[PDB]
Symmetry: C4
């Protein structure tokens, strides 16, 4: 046999590292279709830094964003998301007066705060019609820090003109455009002057766009191809939709996302809008393209329910600490280093067959209780 002392040296006899680079990995796959291979641990998980760029000029201490949906994010969610190092995007399924009030509630309230006034950071969504011009003006007056142009298909003349108008009218304000899933879409909205990109189409838990429009993209592939382009321009991208656990968050970032947006995961929490009901304690969770949401006609989302998840004061820290441990297993001390080591090919990946996915999950038990924390 070989001398154990030569073990590390012998690795050089191999053409490349074990596993695949991100380039080799990247068809039409998404998060559950692969794993990241473990690396070398020479630091505690507590040492892991999770600072993340939301936009060109806005950086969060945590890559967590609550989605602009009327069953996920209002003032209560936005406040506590900001307090916990993330941020919330307030929905616009409401009057411009009602939305502005929610913004004021946040602004008048690791924490995400402005550098000048020390006020909590607040985001909000708007449509791309002429009526939303006045809406935005009201939100800006309320102290809005960042606006999300809310669309399933963001590459449009209407959105492009909206971007151009905001940059001229509100230069200080940061603009996140989307949604997008292709390189060509990204270039268009980057060229328009977007400060960030929202990635995803049909990956949402409550979304059926892909079913009824035949249009969208697998989330993992969308994140890679978009960010591979957008990152060259220093435009941070939000991985929006299909996120359901800590593992999805790590993978989203690995593929180039700067932050991740969550709807269903945050739906059913105490801080979410809507009241609990019993059927088991549930809350309503619905796509904004659902008939209910649109009426509150071609639906692109559904109305459903999610079980009580408790307060995000316990859930977000779980995501935070969990993501720290994830980075540790991979052998990276920050999300910045995570990005660098992936693009350099140091971090390695591996595909997962359907059998490997079943093996990866809980299997062959009479019964079990899934207590995450």
């Amino acid at each position: 046999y070989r001398d154990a002392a030569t073990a590390l040296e012998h690795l050089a006899t191999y053409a490349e590292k074990d596993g695949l680079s991100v380039e080799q990995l990247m068809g039409g796959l998404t998060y559950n279709d692969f794993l990241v291979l473990p690396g070398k641990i020479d630091f505690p998980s507590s040492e892991v830094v999770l600072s993340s760029r939301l936009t060109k000029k806005i950086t969060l201490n945590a890559p967590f964003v609550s989605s602009p949906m009327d069953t996920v994010t209002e003032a209560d969610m936005a406040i506590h998301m900001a307090l916990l190092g993330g941020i919330g995007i307030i929905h616009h399924n409401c009057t411009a007066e009602e939305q502005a009030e929610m913004v004021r509630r946040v602004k008048k309230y690791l924490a995400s705060k402005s550098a000048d006034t020390k006020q909590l950071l607040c985001g909000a969504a708007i449509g791309t019609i002429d009526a939303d011009r006045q809406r935005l003006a009201m939100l800006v007056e309320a102290g809005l820090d960042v606006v999300v142009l809310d669309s399933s298909q963001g590459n449009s003349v209407f959105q492009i003109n909206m971007i151009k108008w905001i940059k001229e009218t509100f230069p200080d304000l940061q603009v996140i455009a989307g949604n997008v899933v292709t390189r060509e879409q990204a270039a268009s909205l980057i060229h328009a002057g977007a400060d960030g990109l929202r990635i995803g189409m049909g990956s949402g838990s409550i979304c059926i766009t892909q079913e009824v429009m035949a249009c969208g993209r697998p989330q993992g592939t969308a994140v890679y191809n978009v960010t591979q382009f957008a990152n060259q321009f220093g435009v941070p991208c939000i991985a929006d939709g299909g996120v359901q656990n800590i593992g999805h968050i790590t993978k989203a970032i690995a593929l180039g996302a700067s932050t991740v947006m969550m709807g269903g995961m945050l739906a059913g929490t105490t801080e979410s809008p809507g009241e609990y009901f019993f059927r088991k304690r549930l809350k309503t969770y619905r796509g904004m393209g659902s008939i209910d949401a649109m009426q509150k006609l071609v639906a692109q989302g559904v109305t459903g329910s999610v079980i009580d998840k408790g307060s995000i004061k316990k859930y977000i820290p779980y995501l935070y600490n969990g993501l720290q441990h994830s980075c540790q297993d991979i052998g990276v001390r920050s999300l910045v280093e995570f990005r660098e080591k992936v693009d350099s090919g140091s971090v390695r990946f591996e595909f997962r067959t359907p059998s490997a996915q079943l093996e990866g999950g809980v299997h062959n038990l009479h019964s079990y209780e899934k207590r995450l924390f």
Copy 2:
């Protein structure tokens, strides 16, 4: 970082567009195995034109055809299908006298109408035996506009001779031959003088041909290979079977289909034959190769039930408006442009892993109600 002003220019640094061309996409896959990537929106969905060639000389305002099945299309269906810009193919699981009466009912009744008499367009199915010669003569007397030669395997001497006979005897009448799923089948029936082709074998919701005959083809692949050939001869093709939502319709056309035929989707509607019953309001839906259908012995279809879908006066417009929005997302202003941009490689596609398909649908909800419109 790169200057945002160079974003669109930088796209030229890439060898090809993001995603796959239809050629690259096209083994043995069907509709659910892929997506169309979104494009550029610079028009309203209302601007989208859905005019479609049914046959060489017949063009519809909507690519919707009701299947010739005794649980789908009789006079009531055919009338309302024509009124809504589509057309109905009346079944022949009935006497020649009974079928001709149904045709007369339609003819004596965006709308699909003749250019000379302004009467509603009507289609009908027949077998390929000698007895159907007289049957057809009766249908022609009733004012039939187009005939469908109804067979699971249309590439036969019997069908070929039937085609040849009709073209000689009834030159004005348009003939749709089928079903076919291969290039060789198409050439044979095109050579015979077919004015259109019916594509599909075993893709039907109620069909088990592939199970009991081991013969057929995945619908998506069948449409591509057949139309890639048939379109060179200006022979429109009907994508028949396996259509269940708007997404399937968009994809069918993307692969080369001119129109799409629906059975199960239209079964259970008010305009369909058969009475509602309760088990939940249901209607019977059965393959014409089912024992029931054949007796009203090797079965190639099944007898089943479908829930009440309501009137097609609300369902077809939903398909219509939905398809308009689908084209908009893709960035095409008509089905003609859709065809052109696909064959040129402007429209791009993406595969879907099993995980991506699960992600694409509704996932990780306690419960939900699927209200399409």
Copy 3:
């Protein structure tokens, strides 16, 4: 557009026929993973001949063989299998005296008959131990026509010596060796003097060999690789296991099988051993490697139940007529021509994605009844 008259000629512009040849098709797939593409119909299904070589010197009018299992084939099954143009292999989970009696019952009783005595053809199974030497002698005295050496793994010194002994002692008797799934296994038993081969390992409905032994092969792949070799020596092969419908039979033969063996399909029929019981009218069906079967300790099969299928006097004709229609759709007039056209590349195949398989089956119905005939 192109002139329709040139349609058939234009096919020559294509490098190869639509679809795949069997070579191109053939990893690790089985029957449900592919389809045969339809061809040209210029004959009635009644014209299709299904004569099939069971062994070097024995030819059946139907490629149907009942498996040697104590819940499938005793005298009653063997008699009626022979009468209907197939043959039955009597099990040996019984005394040598008991088995010989069953053989005598068949011999003393399209039909499969001897050319000299006009008596029904009869097959029987035996083990490969020394005790089975006397057993066989008794079966031969009873008028046995063909013997099956019954083993999950037929490539053994014990089986090889058993083959050699039979050929010397009983030259007239035909010997089917097996089971096998590889080329190397086939060569060994062909070299030993086998008159036919039994193909299959772990493909059985009641079999778990692959689970507990990690040894076996996908049935489709096994048939191709074995027969590709065995056919060069004029050694007919039985495709044994995993057959569940007419489609599987057509595909088995397409890949090189001369006949097919059925257990589960024939289990639960009136002619099968064991009594009906109620739980719905059921019969017991069990692997011969099951603890029950072995005790009537490492099990390689299970004990289960199957619903009443009725008499094989109606089921086998259904298989017969169904297979005729299958050949017709493909455009072949006999199983001999089927073999020839496949090996020449005239018959074409197509893969099936998981989606294509779901599409191929019954889908999207509230409910349905599967009446085959």
Copy 4:
């Protein structure tokens, strides 16, 4: 046709053996994704030797190791595992005093025994913190034969230093490091001075690491790549996790594992800790990363239940005799020969499509009882 006498000779006309070599087989697959092809039987299964290297200096008569989990292995399990030719690894979810007592119970009690004192061999697990240094000293005093450094991610400075310390302080003691799933991890811990490696991350039945950490590897692939490296240094590797039947054990070894570790399979047995309860006779089985286990906060395992499996005095022999039959089918007389014939390419493999896996299992039965032995 060809002369049967030339059958074996004709095999030489083929470029390579039927099926795939292990290299060709080896992406991201695991055990259920493939089969081993049968070989030549020229010996009885009783002749098969299952001696296996646990570590550099420790060899077992059976490749069976019980996992260090508080619902699997305490003194009772460890004793009977050693008696039956395997070994048990005692968990450390208990005080150092409690663990040492369990070791003494084993030491003071085909059988796995020391060569000098004839005492039963005993293994035990420990953490990699400073407190475990004293713990180990107590275990060594109790007569511990081998220590397992218990971690989901063994490639750490803490584990590396722990290894280095043990080799200096307790030279006689054998050290198994892990867990690992990559080549780079292996080299690191081999270089540190490991006497054996524990392979697996997220493949456990009760483990969700891959879900919550996005980190791990398909078990089959992990075993191959790690052992392909580790075996060059004569470092035996334990395939840990995802083992559920005899088939998995055979495959684990085929890919390079020297022994296999079982948790769930041995959970629910009489010799396991914890009492039976009724819900059907069940026992608790839980991941050591479960909240319950950790509290007896980011969970990486779950708490569940498994049905009563009976005594391992009947189960392990079943595994033993089953593995013998498995080797026989493959045509190897020992696990050593198994290794040699695989690396030489004599043993062949075959992929399994999802259809082939369904075909491989029990299918198309009304009902069945799975009696393994």
